[PDB]
Amino acid sequence: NSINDSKILSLQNKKNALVDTSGYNAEVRVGDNVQLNTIYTNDFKLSSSGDKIIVNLNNNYENSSVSFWIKISKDLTNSHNEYTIINSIEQNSGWKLCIRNGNIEWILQDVNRKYKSLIFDYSESLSHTGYTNKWFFVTITNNIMGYMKLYINGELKQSQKIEDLDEVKLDKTIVFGIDENIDENQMLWIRDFNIFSKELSNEDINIVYEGQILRNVIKDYWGNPLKFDTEYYIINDNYIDRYIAPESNVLVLVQYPDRSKLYTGNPITIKSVSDKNPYSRILNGDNIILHMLYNSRKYMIIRDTDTIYACSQNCVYALKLQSNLGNYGIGIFSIKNIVSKNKYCSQIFSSFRENTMLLADIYKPWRASFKNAYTPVAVTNYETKLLSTSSFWKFISRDPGWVE
């Protein structure tokens, strides 16, 4: 509403050139070697050295803010060096965003090279519980009272008044890129860069966050849109260092022979029931099928027709592989992102003979023995466990951002 009314710059991909649609006609020159629109429509990649995008605006303590998504690759966020990725200081005054040792910080320097800044530790020390190589929304607001805030995914992460600091004068130009000499491994993505001529409020910022994330598109581990025909290592949120493996005619979550990694286990490709374009986006409420690659052949993951016990009232079925591919209802699932400002994961559902949900825990998936196992199962009355993390599933895809 009155949010879009204040956009003075808005980098979006139209034909096949990144341009300004704010309506203020800013000059946007993109380096021929820059990959635009590969993950999300209005994203671009800061890859090679001296690879940049130049923005020349038009003439036009104050009210205004900036937003944009950013995704930094493990190696680049691993480095010790400070990388000024977004520069807007022509002489010695202005603003510029930069990243240095797993942190992202917003700097504001006056005409006498003095500054002020808000910083954020997007990497919980590279903990799988952090944002390394994961799309996270940023937002910087500045108002007249001198207060300037830094929000992440719509949450205030830092307040601060522009105190000890002389005069600052913005610059008609803005440069994206890492002029320093980098390597492949060192890469980051940015999408939906926007600038408002007004201090956005917490309540406004979340709205922008809610329409840019794309609720109906299922996301993979990195926050990228999930895709059909793409290989993914599926992990349940409670057992991050376990993988889905067949075992004895019954899928179970097995201990990772080496945690230090991430890409371990039996890769699972997702197929479309209503069959459509090969690597197209998987949407909320879409019928899918799950093929697993194990023993030089593909298998269709299905719901065990017999409960885990010797039913139509609170039953737990195991998961089996099915030699015969094809559109078999018993193998039809659904995935719906979970609303979580901190992690990208989904809930899988099945409605074959009854409405089941997938979650993982300790069971005795076998009738033969008193054998224990951490296995994935389908319940029938998930109204209860609809909020348990044992129902959250993450999809790890080989990502250029995370190399090992």
Max alpha carbon distance in the chain (Å)? 78
320 in a known ligand binding site: yes
> Which residue, 60, 133, 58, 148, is CA-closest to 99?
133
12: left (phi over 0), alpha (psi -120 to 50) or beta: beta
Amino acid at 266: N
Beta-carbon-side half-sphere exposure of residue 176 (alpha carbons within 13 Å)? 26
Q: In the structure encoding, which two tokens stand for residue 1, read together?
A: 């509403």
Beta carbons within 10 angstroms of residue 247's beta carbon: 15
258 in a known ligand binding site: no
Please state, in angstroms and rounded to a whole number, the distance separating the CA atoms of residues 225 and 191.
13
306 in a known ligand binding site: yes
> Which residue, 149, 136, 154, is CA-closest to 192?
136
Q: In the structure encoding, which two tokens stand for residue 358, read together?
A: 């997938």
Q: Please state the separation of Cα 139 from the chain's center in Å.
A: 16
Q: Would you report the helix, strand and coil content of the chain in percent, each value rounded to 5?
A: 5, 40, 50
Helix runs in 49-200, H state only: 74-78
> Which residue, 249, 171, 130, 152, is CA-closest to 209?
152
Q: In the structure encoding, which two tokens stand for residue 153, read together?
A: 């995914």
Task: Give ∠ CA 63-66-71 in degrees, rounded to 5.
Answer: 165
φ and ψ at 293, to 5 degrees?
Answer: -100, 105
Q: List C-alpha distances in Å: 145 to 3, 149, 201, 320, 333.
A: 20, 12, 14, 62, 53
Q: Please state the separation of Cα 79 from the chain's center in Å.
A: 21
Q: In the structure encoding, which two tokens stand for residue 136, read together?
A: 């996270």
Q: Which residues are annotated as a binding site?
A: 305-306, 320, 367
User: Which residues make up each annotated binding site for N-acetyl-beta-neuraminate?
Assistant: 305-306, 320, 367
